[PDB]
Amino acid sequence: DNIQGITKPAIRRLARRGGVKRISGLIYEETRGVLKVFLENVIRDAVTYTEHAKRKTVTAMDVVYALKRQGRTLYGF
Amino acid sequence: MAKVQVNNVVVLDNPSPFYNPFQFEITFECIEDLSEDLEWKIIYVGSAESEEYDQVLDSVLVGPVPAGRHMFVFQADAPNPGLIPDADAVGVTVVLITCTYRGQEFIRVGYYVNNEYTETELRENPPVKPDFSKLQRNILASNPRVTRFHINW
């Protein structure tokens, strides 16, 4: 359905932590979209580490290695 | 584990007019003699809305690449304004330096690019259609985004 995983106040707090002073009303949807995609990409690569490894409970390390798979962004050289 | 390590990128001739070519000084390292192709690309994000307006400005295919530290100036012609949407021409967009090994992109170096008019009149009254001849390109060279991906070497 329209199920969301992050609240509007949470989005405002996250943007505040990023130095954002003002937020457009359209940001709430946009962030909520990006987050969904992000989770979809991580959970996918986590499920492979669980289903192809013959388990039904997704441990933390499955998520850790899926996150490593996603690709690390640094801010310099 | 990764056969190629990108050490540094320097943005040259920046700021510059829009029509000026991009110039990057790339320093990378090969731990081993490369038997497959190394391919560098510069991609201009014409529109943040959609990937379909990307312009691959140039592509350098290198091979075989001997082991050691290599340095070179990647120069690429400025993007085609006829394919850039007006709404995205003026303001902030992205330029990308991609490298691929055996057809797999293992590193993406991104810069934000602020295209602005320099004449205060055009800044107060921007032309209805962007005048690229009067746009200055400011590559935000101080904030590169270096993203590395796991590939099979």
Place this chain on the structure above:
Amino acid sequence: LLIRKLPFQRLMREIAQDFKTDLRFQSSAVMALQEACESYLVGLFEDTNLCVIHAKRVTIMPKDIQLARRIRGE
């Protein structure tokens, strides 16, 4: 943690059901996903602030989030 656990876990369960109805998680995995998502979004907003400082615009727009995603290869 800035994102509360329960609604985020509910979204995770919905995605998991969209992939496999018989699926389950762990408390540590849930918290790890929370930290990952929080850091990712904060970095995106840091990029948006970088975009908006250089524009005469002061409010951040969805275009800035799209640009932050494209620079990273997503």
